[PDB]
Design a protein around this ligand. Structure first.
Ligand SMILES: */C(=C\C(=O)N(C)[C@@H](C)C(=O)NCCCC#Cc1cnc(Nc2ccc(C#N)cc2)nc1NCCC)CN(C)C
Length: 305
């Protein structure tokens, strides 16, 4: 199941909404891409039931010009139920529209065999590992780069809000990096190693990114765009600490739930100004109504002078 979800609001309060399921809608065949034109490199990431692989795609955006892509597909085992979820995700992406700060869909392969979802290739990998690799080479990474990253992510989330979407797993690990230090919001859970990664906690059918979740998500299972603001705040702490695990040194257990519930907030990270930290704290307002909006955040980050 995709952590990126389209929703429809049915009331003024947080819990009044439902998730849009594209299972019954029809797939627009204009996205179909010839399978024989995918020369696969090798794996970029692997989940329990699916993986994203390197691939060279010829003709997908300019004839005579072959480019590199990332192809989300199902694992060698592939019973019918798993494929419909990949189809539903595909359909949703076809209807989202493209944006610079989103890992965009480029095409798909669904007819003559196994399902391939073709996305942009991001040659610098995920933002988390990117920042951690620049811990030595920092002043090469600068403060403005951090501010630009923050801005681009907020822009991407603004686009998702405009498209009535929510991202139930927003974190620096789900942000990718390309040319021009451009970052794109992504979502892989079907192709994410979800539990050798200790940031996800298994609870029934759910795999919860606990340290990134708003209280209403943690305690009531409510996911709104304001939940994303909370998660964005956490992601901000990741950026301006150069990739430190949130609530460093604090284990995910029953005590953690009590901490968040009682209003625990992280301290100012080293590479952040007092202004940026004030913004973080507003994202971590317990009452979802008091958190800033992504249009607010996106505008304010004209701080890059
Ligand atoms: C480009 C720099 C460059 O080419 N490198 C630094 C090379 C040496 C390199 O090894 N890059 C890092 C490879 C690790 C990676 C990756 C990666 C890239 N793109 C995706 N895209 C993607 C798209 C959609 C989904 C979904 N759903 C998932 C992923 N994914 C990954 N890794 C997957 C886990 C993050 C600059 N240049 C051209 C000089």
């Amino acid at each position: 199941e995709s952590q990126l979800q389209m929703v429809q609001v049915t009331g003024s309060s947080d819990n009044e909404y439902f998730y849009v399921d594209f299972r019954e809608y029809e797939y627009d065949l204009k996205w179909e891409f010839p399978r024989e034109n995918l020369e696969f490199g090798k794996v970029l990431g692997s989940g329990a039931f699916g993986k994203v692989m390197n691939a060279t795609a010829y003709g997908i955006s300019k004839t005579g010009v072959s480019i590199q892509v990332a192809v989300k597909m199902l694992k060698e085992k592939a019973d019918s139920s798993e494929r419909e979820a990949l189809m539903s995700e595909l359909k949703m992406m076809t209807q989202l529209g493209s944006h610079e700060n989103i890992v965009n869909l480029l095409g798909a392969c669904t007819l003559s065999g196994p399902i391939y979802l073709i996305f942009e290739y991001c040659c610098y990998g995920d933002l988390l590992n990117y920042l951690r690799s620049k811990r030595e080479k920092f002043s090469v990474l600068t403060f403005e780069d951090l501010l630009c990253f923050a801005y681009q992510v907020a822009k991407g989330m603004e686009f998702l809000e405009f498209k009535s979407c929510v991202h139930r797993d927003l974190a620096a690990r789900n942000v990718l990096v390309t040319h021009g230090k451009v970052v794109k919001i992504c979502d892989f859970g079907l192709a994410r190693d979800i539990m050798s990664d200790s940031n996800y906690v298994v609870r029934g059918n759910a795999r919860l990114p606990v340290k990134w979740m708003a209280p209403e998500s943690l305690f009531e299972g409510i996911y709104t765009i304001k939940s994303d603001v909370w998660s964005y705040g956490i992601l901000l702490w990741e950026i301006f600490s150069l990739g430190v695990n949130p609530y460093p040194g604090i284990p995910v257990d029953a005590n953690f739930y009590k901490l968040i519930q009682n209003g625990f907030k992280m301290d100012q990270p080293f590479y952040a100004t007092e202004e940026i930290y004030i913004i973080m704290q507003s994202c971590w307002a317990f009452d979802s109504r008091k958190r800033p909006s992504f249009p607010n955040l996106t505008s304010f980050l004209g701080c890059q002078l």
